[PDB]
């Protein structure tokens, strides 16, 4: 006699934001009961990045471009920090009437920004059904896209962190070790423009071994 029951009203399609590489990252999945609130923290892609764009998306596809744009806003005033260090908390709050309120808050600066999403910005009933069918028909292509973007984003961050370490080492890194590292950086860069996630993983691995020489001067 202590059971918990689901409410009846749910979201018709997943809701989320665009993340690096043109991916839709879901915050509230399709079929979640309403009201619901979900927050998740994201970071920046460049050192000392001063603003982020929260681009609100509706749909089941993995490329951001294949989902419906519900709205967008910027949060600026992010204080200087290395890429990946700021903490930007994005909150999706859906009330019992099904209205989506999105806000973002920078945990260091305390700055916030928000938008109220219009029901009329969402997909109509025919478009909801088409979206579910198109996502199902394109499941594999969307999975390959997401996994390639994830691998490319990991490879691009490794290029960046390694380049910073070479600069920080400066004269302490011998010229021949610098050359070998720089050869592995270009190789990884070449892999990153292709569509073979496993090839990128290989070149990441080869950069990691030659970046021994940076470790060796720790």
């Amino acid at each position: 006699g202590r059971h918990m029951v689901l409410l009846l009203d749910v979201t018709p399609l997943s809701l989320g934001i665009e993340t690096m590489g043109g991916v839709m990252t879901t915050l509230i999945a399709k079929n979640t009961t309403i009201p619901t609130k979900h927050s998740q923290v994201f970071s920046t892609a460049e050192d000392n990045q001063s603003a982020v764009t929260i681009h609100v998306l509706q749909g089941e596809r993995k490329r951001a471009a294949d989902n419906k744009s519900l709205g967008q806003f910027n949060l600026d005033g992010i204080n200087p920090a290395p890429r990946g260090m700021p903490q930007i908390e994005v909150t999706f709050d859906i009330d019992a009437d099904g209205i989506l309120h999105v806000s973002a808050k920078d945990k260091n600066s305390g700055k916030e920004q928000k938008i109220t999403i219009k029901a009329s910005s969402g997909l109509n009933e025919d478009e909801i059904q088409k979206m579910v069918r198109d996502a199902e028909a394109n499941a594999e292509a969307d999975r390959k896209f997401e996994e390639l973007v994830q691998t490319r984003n990991q490879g691009d961050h490794l290029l960046h962190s390694t380049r910073k370490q070479v600069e920080e080492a400066g004269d302490k890194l011998p010229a021949d070790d610098k050359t070998a590292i720089e050869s592995a950086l270009t190789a990884l860069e070449t892999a990153l423009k292709g569509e073979d996630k496993a090839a990128i993983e290989a070149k990441m691995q080869e950069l990691a071994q030659v970046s021994q020489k940076l470790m060796e001067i720790a």
Side-chain angles (χ1 to χ4, degrees):
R2 289 190 279 204
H3 300 291
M4 303 190 55
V5 182
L6 293 161
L7 305 182
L8 286 197
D9 288 335
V10 302
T11 58
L13 290 174
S14 297
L15 296 160
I17 65 167
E18 182 159 355
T19 58
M20 180 156 73
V23 170
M24 179 176 166
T25 291
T26 293
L27 274 66
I28 296 176
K30 180 181 183 224
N31 283 317
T32 300
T33 62
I34 59 172
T36 177
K37 184 169 164 183
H38 185 99
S39 62
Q40 203 160 320
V41 177
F42 298 87
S43 194
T44 54
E46 295 179 23
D47 289 340
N48 298 328
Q49 190 172 315
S50 58
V52 285
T53 295
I54 294 72
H55 180 196
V56 184
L57 300 170
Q58 179 192 41
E60 305 320 306
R61 306 300 303 280
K62 296 302 176 178
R63 300 198 310 181
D66 298 333
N67 293 292
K68 178 64 171 72
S69 296
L70 298 180
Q72 72 166 65
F73 60 95
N74 293 346
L75 178 66
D76 68 9
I78 303 173
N79 294 320
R83 66 173 285 179
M85 289 299 302
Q87 299 288 289
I88 305 304
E89 182 192 71
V90 174
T91 295
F92 276 33
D93 186 352
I94 306 178
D95 66 26
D97 295 329
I99 298 304
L100 172 60
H101 308 84
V102 178
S103 58
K105 173 166 78 174
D106 175 332
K107 295 187 172 184
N108 174 256
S109 72
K111 296 181 62 70
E112 303 194 25
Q113 191 46 268
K114 66 186 147 50
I115 185 167
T116 297
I117 299 301
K118 295 187 174 66
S120 68
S121 296
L123 293 179
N124 69 33
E125 302 286 2
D126 286 349
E127 285 165 337
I128 286 168
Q129 296 297 294
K130 182 176 168 32
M131 166 64 68
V132 167
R133 281 189 306 272
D134 286 345
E136 283 174 3
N138 288 286
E140 179 69 353
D142 281 9
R143 186 194 61 82
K144 289 171 57 195
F145 164 84
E146 186 172 19
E147 298 186 18
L148 174 62
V149 173
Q150 287 162 25
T151 301
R152 288 165 165 169
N153 285 347
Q154 300 178 335
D156 279 335
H157 204 290
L158 190 59
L159 291 175
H160 181 280
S161 288
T162 305
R163 285 170 166 142
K164 193 162 113 165
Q165 290 152 35
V166 170
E167 287 314 285
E168 281 186 40
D171 293 336
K172 308 214 99 319
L173 188 58
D176 55 7
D177 293 342
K178 183 178 209 253
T179 296
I181 289 161
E182 296 181 324
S183 293
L185 285 166
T186 304
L188 171 57
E189 280 195 324
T190 306
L192 284 165
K193 305 210 264 179
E195 296 189 297
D196 191 336
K197 76 90 190 179
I200 283 154
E201 293 178 345
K203 302 299 177 202
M204 283 175 69
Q205 190 186 97
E206 295 181 7
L207 181 57
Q209 52 199 13
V210 166
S211 293
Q212 210 174 298
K213 303 302 199 148
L214 289 162
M215 308 176 71
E216 185 46 41
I217 63 190

